[PDB]
Amino acid sequence: AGLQCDQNGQYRASQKDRGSGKAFCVDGEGRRLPWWETEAPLEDSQCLMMQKFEKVPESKVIFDANAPVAVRSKVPDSEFPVMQCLTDCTEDEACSFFTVSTTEPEISCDFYAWTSDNVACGSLRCQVKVRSHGQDSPAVYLKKGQGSTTTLQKRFEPTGF
């Protein structure tokens, strides 16, 4: 079905989707990314950062208008409210809760570094409870972590081993 297969037997992490002009950018498997970007330069580097996210959390209960915006809130002063704020937290650590405030007069990118907890837990009977940061038009995104994290005056490095 196309899917723009590069060299080296390797799958490209960006596809100019010719079905309607979209830009879908999955990695080398078949696990979809539920969003849209049509008529925009979404190459590999603009999605290799976008691959480094958990997309939509559990949208069950949003509640607790407390524990405020931890560091900053930059407005999107360009023609892309997501791709401008894409680098703006990933060229930093601790940008865990992240959303574009899509209210009507102005727009701004939200930044929660970290909170106290996001869970109240073979201990399999256990799942995450992240969304407790407001009820409005913005929809939160998650950094997905996995490299060079920091939280509550305690740095962390991927030492491996």
Mind spelling out the 3-state secondary structure of 77-139? CCCCCCCHHHHHHHCCCCCCEEEEECCCCCCEEEEECCCCCCCCCCCCCCCCCCCCCCCCCCC
The secondary element (H helix, E strand) that includes residue 22 is: strand 22-24
Report the candidate in 42, 49, 25, 27 with the shortest Cα–Cα distance to residue 146.
49
8 Å CB contact between 48 and 116? no
| CA distances to 51, 103, 123 from 61, in Å | 26, 20, 23
Rg (the chain; Cα; Å): 17
| CA distances to 49, 78, 105 from 140, in Å | 17, 20, 19
State how far the Cα of 16 lies from the Cα of 140, in Å rounded to an integer: 26
| CA distances to 13, 81, 104, 110 from 74, in Å | 28, 10, 16, 7
State how far the Cα of 35 lies from the Cα of 50, in Å rounded to an integer: 11
Q: How was this structure determined?
A: cryo-EM
